[PDB]
From Swiss-Prot:
GO molecular function: glycosaminoglycan binding; identical protein binding; lysozyme activity
Additional facts recorded: Lysozyme C is capable of both hydrolysis and transglycosylation; it also shows a slight esterase activity. It acts rapidly on both peptide-substituted and unsubstituted peptidoglycan, and slowly on chitin oligosaccharides.
Organism phylogeny: Eukaryota, Metazoa, Chordata, Craniata, Vertebrata
Protein name: Lysozyme C
An example Gene Ontology CC term for this record: extracellular space
Family statement: Belongs to the glycosyl hydrolase 22 family.
Role noted for this protein: Lysozymes have primarily a bacteriolytic function; those in tissues and body fluids are associated with the monocyte-macrophage system and enhance the activity of immunoagents.
Domain C-type lysozyme: 1-128
The species this protein was found in: Meleagris gallopavo
Subunit structure: Monomer.
Gene behind the chain: LYZ
Broad class of where this protein is predominantly found: secreted
Length: 128
C-alpha cells in the first residue's frame, strides 16, 4: 500500500502520535515521505545484511523478524512483514514504542536530515 498524505496524517492523530514525546505529527508525517514516502509496502535492504521495513523504514536486525538477518534481535518480537501492510498503524504501534528510547527522531537521521529543524505544521494545515 501507499497512503495519501492527509488521508493518512489525520490517522496519526488517531494514534495521538501528534505530541508523541512532544513530537508534532507533521514531523512524524514528514519522516513518512522521507523515510516512508508514505508507501506502506516500500522496503529498503541494506548492504548491512538487513532491510529497514514498512513505511517507518526501521531496521529488522534490531526490531522485527523475517527470519532472515544473521544475529538479529527482533525486540519487537514481531513479523517484519506485519508493518509494510496497507495499514501501518501496527508498525506505528511498534515504531511509537521504539521512540521510548532517549535518541528520539534522531534514529531517523533522515529526519534530522529533513524532519529536524523543519516546519512540521507545514503538514497540518488545510487538512482536518
Amino acid at each position: 500500500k501507499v497512503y495519501g498524505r492527509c488521508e493518512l496524517a489525520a490517522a496519526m492523530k488517531r494514534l495521538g502520535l501528534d505530541n508523541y514525546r512532544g513530537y508534532s505529527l507533521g514531523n512524524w508525517v514528514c519522516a513518512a515521505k522521507f523515510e516512508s514516502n508514505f508507501n506502506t509496502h516500500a522496503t529498503n535492504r541494506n548492504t548491512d545484511g538487513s532491510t529497514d521495513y514498512g513505511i517507518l523504514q526501521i531496521n529488522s536486525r534490531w526490531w522485527c523478524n523475517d527470519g532472515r538477518t544473521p544475529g538479529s534481535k527482533n525486540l519487537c518480537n514481531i513479523p517484519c512483514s506485519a508493518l509494510l501492510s496497507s495499514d501501518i498503524t501496527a508498525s506505528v504501534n511498534c515504531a511509537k514504542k521504539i521512540a521510548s528510547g532517549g535518541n528520539g527522531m534522531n534514529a531517523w537521521v533522515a529526519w534530522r536530515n529533513r524532519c529536524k529543524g523543519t516546519d512540521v505544521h507545514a503538514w497540518i494545515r488545510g487538512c482536518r
